[PDB]
Amino acid sequence: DLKEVMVLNATESFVYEPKEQKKMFHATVATENEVFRVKVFNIDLKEKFTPKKIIAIANYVCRNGFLEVYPFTLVADVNADRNMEIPKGLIRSASVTPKINQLCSQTKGSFVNGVFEVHKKNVRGEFTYYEIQDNTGKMEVVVHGRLTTINCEEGDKLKLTCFELAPKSGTGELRSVIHSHIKVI
Known part of the structure; x- marks a missing residue:
């Protein structure tokens, strides 16, 4: 299930469910071939989604063309020796x-x-x-x-x-x- 991605950007954190004060943020990540919008519902994962960071993700949910990150989702760090390189073709075509x-x-x-x-x-x-x-x-x-x-x-x-x-x-x-x-x- 494992996807290794580079983090392009991430919003600030905010409350989406007021009664129990549940928070989330948004992020955009990329593989060499595809850009993905991500919904992150575990706020403690904030450091992991810092611009330019390389991370590995499995047991995400797919819904409405977003990847959703919950507690059953594995988010891990990747060693420097991965040398991830995203084609600027893909990254300009990103935020249009x-x-x-x-x-x-x-x-x-x-x-x-x-x-x-x-x-x-x-x-x-x-x-x-x-x-x-x-x-x-x-x-x-x-x-x-x-x-x-x-x-x-x-x-x-x-x-x-x-x-x-x-x-x-x-x-x-x-x-x-x-x-x-x-x-x-």
Whole structure:
């Protein structure tokens, strides 16, 4: 089951389940051939997921195109003599923000990552709506719950992690879900 990977980046840690204060973080890792987004539900594993570190992983769970790391998952250290080298081809193709017009072109559901410019902001009750826009188009980001407490003004840019892309009658939409994360630039 063993995958040896290089850690590209990792977010800060945050609460996704409030009642028992369970925390997680997000990470991106790579083999020579593939980039993987990772959901890490054991916070004590933070040091192990440091940028440029080489690690070995087995007994992960696969769900919605993420690898999920739980206590039954083996995460081990790899010796220096592995000399892992990731082709820059793979790593640039890594963190590419999709164009909004293709996002509003999908009917299949997915979970998206990317840096988007904040065009407009509207608050409706327990809901915050961001309109995002690029050279190809625009669409709304629907935020409910915990992520509404992070402040973001017009003109700012947002690094979104694990947003749900949902098709509408007609148009697409992005919505916060339980593992979503926002970073403001």
